[PDB]
């Protein structure tokens with residue numbers, strides 16, 4: 001992978017692996033999400049961010065601040081097959097004092113055709129207190145050096161799906177998967193549950209018949225609170241709709257504290 | 270990746286990814302195992318095996334036969350760090366009518382130093398009845414075309430660890446992790462639990478203090494029966510000693526054995 005000519009975005013190619021594909025012999029949405037994470041991390045390393053596992057700037061480390069994901073939104077038009085090469089371009093942009101965004105575009109490397117796109121929203125947090133806060137001027141100035149100054153959005157459309165408010169699912173859920181728990185492979189280098197694991201947990205409560213007859217087109221997921229390595233999660237889903245739509249909720253198995261909420265949209269194969 | 274000059278082995282390089290590393294910022298043993306699986310599948314594709322999830326020969330498809338893993342044995346001397354390049358060479362060899370072996374050698378791509386090695390034993394099974402079988406003359410002849418004819422072993426040492434018998438752990442286990450279950454990401458393209466998932470389940474019952482103070486040097490794992498996608502597993506571990514452990518995976522309800530194994534760990 002490498003930064004582009006203007007130094008304001010980064011591109012990397014990936015060959016889809018045998019163990020990364022599902023039933024259709026195409027990459028799962030969790031494989032796609034892991035590739036988005038990887039190209040994002042390689043871009044951060046290329047522009048001087050930390051390699052400790054939290055990717056922080058110089059001012060962030062002094063003030064014990066970290067970035068945390070607030071939302072992930074992915075839209076896939078075609079999933080790459082085993083052995084195919086996918087090229088992914090990624091870039092960041094500040095959004096004033098609210099937080100920052102990392103966007104991605106996925107392409108079929110052979111044809112140059114766009115096969116997917118994604119956007120993520122990040123908020124600043126004190127690493128010790130876990131309290132959210134606004135982005136300071138000094139941090140905003142560091143971002144200006146590696147981000148485009150004119151808006152560059154993977155989702156330009158008017159008041160598009162990526163910014164839509166997600167409601168809270170009401171009991172009883174139509175479907176559920178209970179007692180989900182992370183194993184060591186689900187943790188990152190800092191012993192936190194990997195963001196991609198929550199996508200897998202959301203999808204666990206989609207009935208197998210839907211997975212067999214449809215393809216996932218869109219997933220939007222809010223991150224409210226972390227699942228700790230000793231926590232247990234219940235995954236709830238209710239149909240809201242030739243396209244099937246679902247509302248999702250992940251909550252702690254005991255007291256029912258919300259950890260994530262989301263929506264998915266699926267198209268018949 | 271590519272077949273070597275003599276067409277009898279295959280090599281591929283991998284750049285270690287951010288999400289593939291553990292606390293030490295080095296690749297986990299499950300990441301290593303996934304890379305061994307990938308280079309094995311790319312080698313099978315390069316010599317004419319099927320690309321439908323079950324790497325099968327022409328005479329195996331006719332008779333509805335598949336290969337199933339009986340044992341995996343991995344020894345790691347150094348784990349590659351995030352961003353490092355590891356080169357892996359793999360090859361197969363028939364073992365008469367018993368079954369076949371796939372072996373691997375892992376190297377640091379920059380220095381050429383061997384950083385790990387692995388060996389796996391495979392047995393033939395009828396895909397419909399699930400009944401184990403001996404290797405027929407016609408399949409042995411097909412293997413002879415892409416395998417070295419003189420013995421080539423990743424583990425040559427006299428009566429070495431890779432062939433050692435593993436005993437069955439007796440209750441009460443010293444440690445346990447119960448109620449483990451596969452999610453969709455743990456399944457392969459044919460909806461079977463991926464072989465690497467069982468390694469993760471074995472390791473779940475190793476106390477966190479050991480993982481924090483030691484590095485895994487050797488893991489030997491027998492595969493007795495598959496965990497179905499709707500099954501629940503208990504992972505049991507007992508110290509037998511460097512720290513050494515005996516492992517057992519069994520169904521959460523009736524206690525049917527699915528795997529047994531051993532691990533050896535060295536202090537960091």
Ligand SMILES: O=C(O)C1Cc2ccccc2C1
Pocket residue numbers: 033034036037040041069071072120195196199
């Ligand atoms: O974690 C990251 O680096 C981003 C990529 C990714 C993939 C799945 C969910 C959230 C996010 C945010």
Ligand SMILES: O=C(O)C1Cc2ccccc2C1
Pocket residue numbers: 302303305306309310338340341389464465468
């Ligand atoms: O499944 C395979 O292809 C082989 C590689 C691998 C990795 C972990 C456990 C078993 C095996 C056998």
